[PDB]
Amino acid sequence: FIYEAFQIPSGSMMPTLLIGDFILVEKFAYGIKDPIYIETGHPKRGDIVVFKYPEDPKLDYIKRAVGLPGDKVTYDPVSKELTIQPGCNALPVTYSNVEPSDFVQTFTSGFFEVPKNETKENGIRLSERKETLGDVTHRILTVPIAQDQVGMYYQQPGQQLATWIVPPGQYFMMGDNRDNSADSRYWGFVPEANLVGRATAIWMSFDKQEGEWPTGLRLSRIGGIH
């Protein structure tokens, strides 16, 4: 397996990946099969994938693969919940109770880790919940005063707004920081050709703000991604 490291400059995958994380990615592999007598690397649903931005292939993006080839994906912008129908059958999708997250967003915008007992001026506390897609559980953040404007979505020819059917060999990507993520909702599907790898680990983390320099080290974050 071939490996590549990446810095996380933005907040689009909070709380799973933070600004200032450094991650290791495992590149996807074409299988090496002996037809006389490895397996081909594909995203599984829920995988954190690095990929080349389709519209400008010189930029690397990192999102979660929530939609696989054939998936009918529907997003309800009010509840901020996905529905997924594979091979279009309904994928089991569950959501936990909303609770206050560790983060406040100021509003460009910055994010701050603020303890749940405190408050911060010019800020909104982000909510957190668990999203389960099939067999994979991960956290998402939502901004309680935010809601997508569906008229601004990438609209797939043939489809109502806020519903997409993933073409063969393509993926529907979404960020865990659901109100702060420019993802497939807005710029459409990601082709197979554009995938780089799957995020496997945080190998280093620096405590910093989006444009600022590091305030410290978050060694507690080194390890698996969950």
């Binding site: 490291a5 990446f6 689009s12 690397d60």
Partner: peptide, 6 residues
């Protein structure tokens, strides 16, 4: 690498 992912 060491490059960024947005």
């Amino acid at each position: 690498x060491x490059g960024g992912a947005y």
